[PDB]
């Protein structure tokens, strides 16, 4: 219930967004191929 809690430029918002998304994709993909490449674990 406390919106507009940012004191930085309007760009800082976009930056934080990309980072979060990227990071997720980074591991998601990196692990997706890496893991799917080894396949040395009980597959669900």
């Amino acid at each position: 219930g406390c919106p507009a809690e940012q004191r930085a430029s309007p760009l800082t918002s976009i930056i934080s967004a990309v980072v979060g998304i990227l990071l997720v994709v980074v591991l998601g993909v990196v692990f997706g191929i890496l893991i799917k490449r080894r396949q040395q674990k009980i597959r669900k």
Copy 2:
């Protein structure tokens, strides 16, 4: 034999830069803490 034949805006360059760096940091950090947290490899 003529790669990098893109004439996209000057911003496209910055985007590609951040991505590369971020990705590296993502795994580097994510693995740094995760691995350093488990420490289940090559025991001294």
